[PDB]
Design an enzyme around this catalytic site. Structure first.
Site, PDB file in Angstrom:
ATOM      1  N   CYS A 381      37.288  27.464  39.433  1.00 29.39           N
ATOM      2  CA  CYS A 381      36.537  28.097  38.844  1.00 29.39           C
ATOM      3  C   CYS A 381      35.555  26.985  39.155  1.00 29.39           C
ATOM      4  CB  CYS A 381      37.376  27.784  36.879  1.00 29.39           C
ATOM      5  SG  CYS A 381      37.805  26.216  36.957  1.00 29.39           S
ATOM      6  N   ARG A 386      40.157  25.581  34.516  1.00 31.21           N
ATOM      7  CA  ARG A 386      39.744  27.160  34.516  1.00 31.21           C
ATOM      8  C   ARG A 386      41.211  28.309  35.470  1.00 31.21           C
ATOM      9  NH1 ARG A 386      34.223  29.524  33.765  1.00 31.21           N
ATOM     10  NH2 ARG A 386      34.148  27.658  35.117  1.00 31.21           N
TER      11      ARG A 386
HETATM   12  C1  LIG Z   1      36.065  17.210  32.237  1.00 34.17           C
HETATM   13  N1  LIG Z   1      34.985  18.561  33.614  1.00 34.17           N
HETATM   14  C2  LIG Z   1      35.863  17.930  35.373  1.00 34.17           C
HETATM   15  C3  LIG Z   1      33.902  16.706  33.685  1.00 34.17           C
HETATM   16  C4  LIG Z   1      34.700  19.767  33.659  1.00 34.17           C
HETATM   17  C5  LIG Z   1      36.594  20.711  32.911  1.00 34.17           C
HETATM   18  C6  LIG Z   1      35.143  21.474  33.016  1.00 34.17           C
HETATM   19  C7  LIG Z   1      35.902  23.302  32.205  1.00 34.17           C
HETATM   20  N2  LIG Z   1      34.853  24.300  33.130  1.00 34.17           N
HETATM   21  C8  LIG Z   1      34.244  23.873  34.659  1.00 34.17           C
HETATM   22  S1  LIG Z   1      32.795  24.787  35.115  1.00 34.17           S
HETATM   23  N3  LIG Z   1      34.703  22.185  33.910  1.00 34.17           N
HETATM   24  C9  LIG Z   1      33.700  19.417  32.213  1.00 34.17           C
HETATM   25  O1  LIG Z   1      34.416  19.255  30.968  1.00 34.17           O
HETATM   26  O2  LIG Z   1      32.810  20.769  32.292  1.00 34.17           O
END
Ligand SMILES: C[N+](C)(C)[C@@H](Cc1c[nH]c(=S)[nH]1)C(=O)O
Ligand SMILES: [Cl-]
Ligand SMILES: [Cl-]
Ligand SMILES: [Cl-]
Ligand SMILES: [Mg+2]
Ligand SMILES: [Mg+2]
Length: 426
Positions: A381, A386
């Protein structure tokens, strides 16, 4: 009063396309959990899942139509008892469904005879119901549990308030930053993973029960992932299983399932109980994680595919998905498996109560795009959250070669030498 259908009549209709067999028990019982002590768990072969729990959902009728259950169909309901189906049967008739029957003898008549075909989610015991977690923390005797060491872990992304505002009694919190790096948003190195797990009290032979709390993520916020705690939980389940924790469970539906069951919550800030040694090499399951070099090979291979688990606006390059992702677009050659509305929701893989969507539906949708278990699949993703939830669902089906391409679009688009597509696909 509702018409009863007999075991003999139902058997004769299992292949009929005008009959819809509907299992009104919990999704966990449908998946295979023997919630009444039955010897054979799961559902009647061909049955759909429509938990009677959902009858209070004002969108219940749209759920039914989204499942393609039509007024022309002959509807056959069953639960643990025919009384489970009484309210569902009435609801169907109140909304124009006039051919409705109840099968009274699912348990123990259908479950207790091997001639009656049943189906189940093959690795259902990795997706636990709230009652199983309750028995575990209460010391009771529970099925699918042969261990003496466990830990309930409340996952969150830089948001301890998600845990402090209310958690499962005895559980400790794990920030996702403990297992993934804010530089790459990939899993941390084995040396870091070993220390992070030891410091949270986890060995390779500990049964880890992960859940998160959904708090309505908002794209306007600087950190929407802080509100998507159960995706983060399944993300951490991926990393722990990759590291080598042998028994990782996910609470189906996360925190909402705990409170939906009427169980007591706690607000204590439980301190961690460190363990001196993880007890196994990291990573013990390297095949679960795929990096960009292997991911590029899988694009050129007939035996393999990358599975884009992003939203449609991300897929066509309308948005980047996350506020730290610079470039908009998609990885050419990947198979699209639309996650849901944006980068922080999984509507296409989840029910309204956040339990996993009926796995047969996920299977048929995936198969329509050539996503099948004979291939090596790497789900991905934006940064691997995801894709982990998609991967976990395939793992629950017993698929033999499923991975997460960790770097995802973030890593791919950070290198300007990597190709990418935009726009609506021709
Ligand atoms: C925790 N994280 C790794 C910084 C991501 C996780 C995420 C969820 N969707 C996407 S795109 N990234 C976020 O919260 O954006
Ligand atoms: Cl139980
Ligand atoms: Cl925020
Ligand atoms: Cl979530
Ligand atoms: Mg049918
Ligand atoms: Mg990543």
């Amino acid at each position: 009063d509702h018409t009863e259908i007999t075991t003999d009549s139902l058997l004769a209709l299992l292949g009929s396309e005008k009959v819809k067999i509907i299992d009104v028990r919990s999704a966990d019982a449908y998946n295979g959990w023997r919630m009444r002590g039955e010897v054979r768990g799961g559902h009647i072969k061909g049955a759909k899942s429509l938990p009677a729990k959902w009858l209070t959902d004002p969108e219940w009728l749209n759920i039914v139509r989204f499942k393609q259950i039509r007024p022309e169909d002959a509807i056959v309901l069953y639960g643990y008892t025919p009384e489970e189906c009484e309210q569902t049967a009435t609801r169907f008739k109140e909304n124009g469904y006039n051919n409705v029957s109840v099968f009274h003898r699912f348990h123990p008549d259908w479950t207790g005879n091997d001639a009656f075909p049943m189906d189940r989610l093959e690795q259902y015991n990795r997706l636990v119901p709230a009652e199983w977690v309750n028995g575990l923390i209460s010391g009771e005797e529970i099925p699918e549990y042969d261990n003496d060491t466990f830990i309930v872990c409340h996952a969150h992304y830089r948001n301890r308030d998600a845990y402090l505002s209310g958690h499962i009694p005895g559980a400790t919190d794990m920030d996702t930053l403990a297992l993934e790096s804010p530089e790459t948003w990939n899993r941390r190195t084995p040396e870091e993973l070993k220390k992070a797990l030891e410091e949270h009290g986890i060995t390779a032979s500990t049964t880890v029960v992960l859940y998160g709390k959904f708090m309505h993520p908002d794209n306007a916020d600087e950190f929407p992932g802080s509100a998507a705690g159960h995706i983060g939980a399944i993300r951490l389940a991926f990393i722990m299983m990759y590291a080598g924790v042998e028994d990782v469970r996910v609470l189906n539906g996360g925190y909402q399932s705990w409170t939906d069951a009427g169980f007591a919550i706690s607000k204590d800030d439980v301190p961690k109980t460190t363990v001196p040694e993880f007890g196994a090499p990291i990573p013990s399951r390297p095949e679960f994680a795929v990096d960009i070099d292997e991911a590029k090979e899988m694009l050129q291979s007939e035996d393999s595919d990358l599975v884009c688990v992003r939203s449609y606006p991300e897929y066509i390059g309308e948005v980047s998905g996350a506020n730290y992702i610079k470039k908009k677009g998609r990885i050419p050659g990947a198979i699209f498996a639309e996650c849901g509305s944006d980068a922080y929701h999984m509507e296409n893989y989840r029910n309204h109560d956040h339990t996993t969507r009926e796995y047969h539906e996920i299977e048929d949708i995936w198969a329509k795009s050539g996503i099948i278990p004979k291939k090596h699949l790497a789900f991905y993703c934006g940064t691997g959250w995801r894709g982990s939830e998609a991967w976990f669902n395939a793992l629950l089906m017993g698929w033999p070669r499923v991975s997460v391409y960790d770097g995802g679009w973030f890593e791919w688009s950070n290198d300007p030498e990597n190709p990418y597509e935009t726009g609506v696909p021709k």
